[PDB]
Symmetry: C4
Subunit: 305 residues, 4 copies
């Protein structure tokens, strides 16, 4: 049936490959710090309208003007929220991967360099934090270029991972064509990395490593209609996810992503969720807390194409 | 008043019939595993646009294009979530009924045969998982035929139950005209099976056994605006539902359905809900955990038309 | 400022009147059982489209046809949910008031008679359960006549209370012009009854006794965007509201309404909320559990215009 | 990059200034009682349509007519909810700042005077409680004048604080140009006050003290789609927010705002969240429960414009 169908619904099937994580880890835990603030929709950036998504104003209108509430909500993340998250990771000696938006990174260079100073990975989260669904591949390719160049120029580091989020039908192709990415995270389809065959211009295909991310174990759900009400909701969700995976780790260890946003989890009332979750996983043996790039390198070494 | 009114508001009235479940069960528990992944709206399938319903992106837009995030969200169900659910049932030696979308069944034939190998019932959930409200009866009838043929072709099993979900005003009639269905579950109107007089072409009626399903005791509510935040919310709902029914079962035993979706309850952070509920009901005497078709056979034997 | 302004923002001000409830009650608790099922938007009733409001499908579209899922969701209330609620009150020997839709009462006359048999009050909740905001007063007045007459024909009771819910700017005047009501509950503005001056024809005002109702302490919030997720959310809300009122009762006793819908609270998973709340208030001295009409008669005797 | 960019994404950076609150407070807690009821959208007030926002009917339509449910939900706040909140603060001997809507204040003058007699601050929350995003700055400046004048005529107090809420791209400039304000709270960008350079006419900027407010530690979230289901949700969110800040207060004390609405938190079912939170903060040493004007005066004295 439908031999040419361009989606893999089967994956590993019933019995996934043995991850063989370092330290016989039962689960690999991968915290993602999104840094988008300064790169979002804003007429100041030449966008037609103000930002609507992932704010304290759930269901916000877009205006062909500056929306000040929305701007200072985003400014919280870069002014305050980010530092609160970074302090907590530093105090615990734990790494994370920053999904850095290029324009955001240029607007706050001292913070961007603090990320590198703290030893965190920076992956490229696009030049702009905007919806790419309808953008032509020529323009999207231009932004990819601007995004990587911005990050490298400011931090001295060349990202090795890509994640747009609100991507287009072309983004996987554009990542493969640009090349040099050890992983692409625009995928919610599994609990382990795997390889995708990405069709490129000409119709032929090229292997790309996918390191799947998450939209459910993600503080973005504080700003969506179905959405954690309190720190303890997000904490219990993470805790439960971790417990399920950790118990599976005797048979077939998996990975877990945790999605974080400066302007969201950085709020003091939500931040307790991170503290509680870290305390939880610290009680467990055989947990690898890894940079995303470390999981990609591990996969490429142990589970080559 | 309104003698010809074609809805039964009254049902069993204040005193329902005695279920007389096997083993003098106080309640019959019927777990449903929806399998829709591969059958949803997608331009690959010839649909106008991408899927909007029952994902991690609540309030998602439809695009006349492939929506990648939506596709990998669905792929999660077929790749990973399904197996997590099937493992739990298997470990506990419990049966369930699959509401299998024909197209999805065809796209993952090894999994479809695994359902049968594991002893689960497969019912027909339509050829496509698309809204049928506005579809003409000619077109909807063709889909029913395609759905039934697909499932039997792949699994060797002819379904005996029908459930569309987002059905049309004609769907009951189409089930009746097709024939051979021991039960139809397009109904949220009671806590016990019952007989519906279904008007067929010509305007005469034919009895159809209804086994009612559920939109509240259903993990779909993780993806709706009013919607469980954590595993514990879904667990407590099911627990409470069961508890109320179990207490009623000293006087008038009822059934309870539980709706599950691979891409939703199969996520690790939701999955704890199922484990906690199974643990809860395991502690109770006089629980019949049944395949949907076993409940319909029971009713036909003990409560004939 | 604005001498002529026709809203009373002030009410009792800082020190309300002493309620002086029977038995020196600290709080008067008034349960409402809305009975709308069979009176909702349906093309079978000559309405343009299918019901959208207060269902298991939050955000439902309206169709110019029968919406089967919506119909059976409503049928659950008349078929099953109503009897579960009536059993609980009967078992505890407690009264409630029914807010009865005339058409729904006419479609289930045996149940309507059962409400009277069990000693509950029946108040008029309109001829139809539909939005009245945009209706002309000529048309609205006709519906009021039809609702009052339906209820009286079926049950033999002449309602002494009125509640539309989704009312119009004319409804209070219509209730005043109709005459013979002891109270109107189309108001969410206080914790005590109070008297409203309603303008009728001929430049005259007439007093109307308001007994305020509730949109927060109401199971309707299970079907609204901001929405109790579990039974315990609704119980805890009721519990808390009661506790706050009860503590105020040593200085200035108030009343509390609880809103219930057969198709919502009647579901097993929600129903625990009622049981738990009833157990809670049973532990408390000096609680008057009252028919609405009994509160109105008390007010008219002890706190006349 | 983008030298001219008119947003400060950086603020204090990684080490904020030492707040040095009175009493060596670890955290300054600032309760805000919004008073909008009687000032909201209503055809009686000359608006096109009925109110849709911050009610028990979430997702309400607007009607070019009176919407009675919406009117009585709003009247609960002025008839009942307000006195319940005020009783609680009175019993505990605690102050708050009222974000008072000019029109609402004029329609309940005894209550407005009660705010003053109870020792609370009144800040100006606009003449009208409506969306100002699309309003022209001539129109918006006229409302500012009317709001300030109404408050002052009714209560005798000249507000020293401004909060619109649903503001416009011009409101900071309108506040700067009006003069006499000690602070503006139309900002959600930090855990401490700070100074903003506000552009006025003639190519001149003037400094404006911001005392940031909150949209998350706010009972408005009982009336929004992502939104506390019970009293305990709001209490636990406030508790957690306070605990986090209180733990930071050993290195760098910050402030916390708590947003309250008469028609929301004043409901018995919600009100327990306030009581439980106050009980939590009562058990903690070194908490300054402040009027918003007191925090502004503090910053001006200890952290002058830099």
């Amino acid at each position: 049936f439908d031999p040419n169908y361009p989606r893999d619904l089967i994956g590993y099937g019933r019995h996934p490959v043995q991850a063989n994580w370092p330290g016989r880890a039962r689960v690999a835990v991968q915290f993602v710090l999104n840094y988008e603030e300064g790169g979002e929709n804003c007429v100041l950036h030449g966008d037609p309208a103000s930002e609507q998504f992932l704010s304290e104003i759930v269901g916000a209108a877009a205006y062909p003007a500056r929306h000040m509430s929305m701007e200072s909500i985003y400014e919280y993340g870069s002014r305050a929220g980010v530092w609160r998250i970074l302090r907590e990771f530093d105090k615990r000696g734990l790494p994370l991967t920053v999904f850095g938006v290029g324009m955001a990174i240029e607007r706050h260079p001292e913070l961007a360099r603090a990320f590198v100073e703290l030893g965190h990975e920076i992956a490229c989260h696009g030049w702009r934090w905007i919806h790419y669904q309808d953008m032509t591949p020529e323009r999207e390719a231009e932004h990819m270029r601007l995004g990587m160049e911005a990050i490298e120029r400011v931090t001295g580091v060349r990202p090795l991972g890509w994640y747009t989020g609100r991507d287009s039908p072309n983004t996987h192709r554009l990542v493969a064509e640009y090349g040099g990415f050890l992983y692409d995270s625009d995928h919610y389809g599994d609990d382990l990395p795997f390889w995708m065959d990405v069709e490129v211009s000409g119709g032929a295909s090229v292997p790309q490593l996918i390191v799947p991310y998450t939209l459910d174990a993600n503080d973005m759900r504080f700003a969506t209609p179905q959405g954690f009400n309190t720190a303890d909701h997000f904490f219990h969700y993470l805790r439960d996810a971790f417990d399920v995976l950790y118990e599976e780790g005797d048979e077939a260890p998996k990975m877990m992503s945790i999605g974080m946003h400066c302007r969201l989890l950085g709020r003091p009332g939500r931040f307790r969720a991170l503290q509680r979750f870290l305390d939880h996983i610290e009680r467990h043996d055989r947990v690898w807390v890894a940079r995303r790039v470390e999981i990609a390198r591990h996969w490429r070494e142990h589970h080559p194409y």
